[PDB]
Amino acid sequence: MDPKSLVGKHALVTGASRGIGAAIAEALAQAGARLTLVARKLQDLEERVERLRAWTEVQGEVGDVADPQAMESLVHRAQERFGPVAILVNNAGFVLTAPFLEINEELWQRHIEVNLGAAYRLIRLLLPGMLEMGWGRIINISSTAGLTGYPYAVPYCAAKHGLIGLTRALALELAQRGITVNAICPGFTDTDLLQASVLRVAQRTARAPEAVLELFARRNPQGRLVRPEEVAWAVVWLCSEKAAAINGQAIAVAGGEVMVG
Amino acid sequence: MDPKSLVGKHALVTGASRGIGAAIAEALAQAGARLTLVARKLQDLEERVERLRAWTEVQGEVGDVADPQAMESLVHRAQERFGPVAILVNNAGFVLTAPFLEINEELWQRHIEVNLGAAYRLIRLLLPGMLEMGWGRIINISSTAGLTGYPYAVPYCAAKHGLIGLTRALALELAQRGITVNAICPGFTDTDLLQASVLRVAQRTARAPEAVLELFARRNPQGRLVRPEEVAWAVVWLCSEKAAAINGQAIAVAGGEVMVG
């Protein structure tokens, strides 16, 4: 990508304070896009906004993507300051692994609403602006669980696969409207949250954290975790005008764990 | 298949009064399975039960698969009469095509609950019986909308793709527990509901119903609609013990419209 590629394009990213969302925001900022970063907590969001102001005009907003009323108000405030959103990156996730019979109606609904319902409601709010402008990019951060199954992750796989279905059908519906709809499907990514789970099980099984990291990296044929910057690289690539022919695709960022076709 | 293959196997089929569900019930009845047929209306359900009693012991139960309390009671009554369910065929569907922006929260939720949530709740209720027996078959009737996108059918594609995700993850979870979990994905099938829509468009465009049937059959490379019996043939094939190696699969019954891999 060029240094002044997405200049004058308002991009909104959810789950932006840390991990994958933070790296996506950083890659879009280095490309010149004006950013709206959405996160659940005030801590880490304001620090990310201050850091990314060195490259572009950045803004932060706190809100729960599951709450429709909170998002309807948040979207209005963000579009009032930086205009309509041209690039939307849906990066909200939730996974609680358990045997299928131990998943009650409430936990089933939470997986569906966070991983699929939130993206539906945000697209519904920002799509009129994209249609009015005649150009747009909707990028859904799904997972390898949206392309393949995992035991003990039935609700997560069902919701993430549903996000690929939403991606594919909407890509065809908006094909001749100047908007592309794509999904990026990362495998296990090296985030501060993952490093805490590695350190937790290492402290509980009397093992070194490096030995525990091997268990997480085992599914990746490259023998390592995916870096958040590698997920972000796939996102920024799609925002270019030369990526207009990329539509309805699920790009796996998992070292070969899932090989799409 | 053999004429006395599924003798002594209790099979429960939803959406059994007409179309695909009726053909599935007929094929399972000719194979010798004891049937519990679930449908929303009393009318065609009792007629189907009376017709299928010529081949096997049949039972009819009326209930809304979206209501959990109604299904919890229905399952208890059916298992009291014919014992635990060994074969579950989830065939509940709902589709209302519209532009994405014209899909309110209520309509979005209805697509998710009928096409995905109902299968989750019925599997949750009948899986303990299958685990106790050490053998079972969970067959989810999805659609080609679970494998590819269609414009103006975003919620239907999202829910049907979610049913493939549920299928895949649960197939891995139950792989060494004697149960196979598979999805059958029909394309446009020649049902009384579809024939009403073809006759409606023929009477609105001054065309013969045969010319309108060409538009519906256009996506099928074979130039015809899928027959309900062809969907049923794929269901009964999976119930055999020789189909134990078929697990986590999505079988498209669409003449080549979707070519799986």
Add this chain to the structure above:
Amino acid sequence: MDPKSLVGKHALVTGASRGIGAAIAEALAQAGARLTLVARKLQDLEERVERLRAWTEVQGEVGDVADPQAMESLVHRAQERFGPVAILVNNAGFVLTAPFLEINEELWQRHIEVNLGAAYRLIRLLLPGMLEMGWGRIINISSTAGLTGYPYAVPYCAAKHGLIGLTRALALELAQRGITVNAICPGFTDTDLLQASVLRVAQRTARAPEAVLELFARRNPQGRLVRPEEVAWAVVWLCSEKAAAINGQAIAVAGGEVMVG
């Protein structure tokens, strides 16, 4: 199948003397099809023919499927005795696992000619007869290596994927000609050929053959090898007239190792 049995249908099966091919021939013989069994050696072929004559009219023919002149003559002799071939099961395979740089031009060509070229030439020879009759079934026995990659099996994966490509394009070309073209993709199957591949990789990775057998069965989520009868069950299912809507599909028989969609 009893109501729509294969009586009066000439079926030709390659690699028929042992393993998957023998189980396919047995299933087709019990269904009433007249069989032409092709194999490289005379030894187990004539024993299989004598055993299967209890169910149907069987014929044995020896030949190398890689040699075009030998197959052109063999086909002529078989069609002279039992008329044109209605069902063709391409079950010729060859795999020699090695690092990519240790695969010379000769060995690369052998993988392409046995696993893909042989199916092309046999379809070219028998397709005019199927078109004349207005009905036919072409069933290509590929592998999970036709749907996913495996290290140290690059030429085998390339040739087996090519067979899926042949399957898909020809299914669309013959969609309205009464013929279905499908592929069955088994995982590791319990055969004498598998035992040779186990001993080969054990001698190359400094491991015991029992550890290699367990490693291959570990790829199958069901914790066991696929039975040849399970592959045969998927073949005979496709030959029914009720399986006319199954076209251009790749059916994985691998317990969930590969989940198609």
Add this chain to the structure above:
Amino acid sequence: MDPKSLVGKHALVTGASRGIGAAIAEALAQAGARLTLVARKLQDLEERVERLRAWTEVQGEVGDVADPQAMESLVHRAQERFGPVAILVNNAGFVLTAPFLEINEELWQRHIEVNLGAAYRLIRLLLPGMLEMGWGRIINISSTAGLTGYPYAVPYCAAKHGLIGLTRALALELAQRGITVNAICPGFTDTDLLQASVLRVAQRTARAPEAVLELFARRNPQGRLVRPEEVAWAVVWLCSEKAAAINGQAIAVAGGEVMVG
């Protein structure tokens, strides 16, 4: 020049004088890679080399990729001038559409050798250099015919699917060796080669070339042909170190015609 990403990386591109190959060479030249451009004809290759010397050090070599002896010598000459090849883009293609029965052994072999065999031999020649350097990129330009079937293009689909199988297996084999192997699958692209295919099908189906061009653009949901720049954009994206996690993937560049997963 500002984009200094692939500076000091020797990239070899086949089919580089015109169309997709020319756009790939242009994108790699603007990124700072030293280029070896291979084409069958001296015409247009020398002119492309002279034009691209404004951005980077370029070299032109004429040779038939089907001939192994000619390629073995060509590779030696190119590596003598610019050192070992770090990026290999296999963009050799050949398609002659016809009914399956009108494809003789010679024409079948030409499709296999040009679309699949040439990539195998070039990877075999350049992979030792990539392993020695500890870094590499193998990018196979396949097609939507490598992911789905097309009537009247059976040999092209078989060879292009085989190139995806080569891509997948080799990606796993080289996963921990610093090299990624991926395939880019364009749909109908606006090139001089496409105009020849349009004129060929028009002369064979008694239709005007304008009607054939519209029929091919109708398969693309975006209602237009893919631009060569769009295919090139997907190639250069993969060459970055931030695309190291993209391995064993097939990226469709077809507006949503094929939706990978």
Add this chain to the structure above:
Amino acid sequence: LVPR
């Protein structure tokens, strides 16, 4: 949540 710092704006601007």
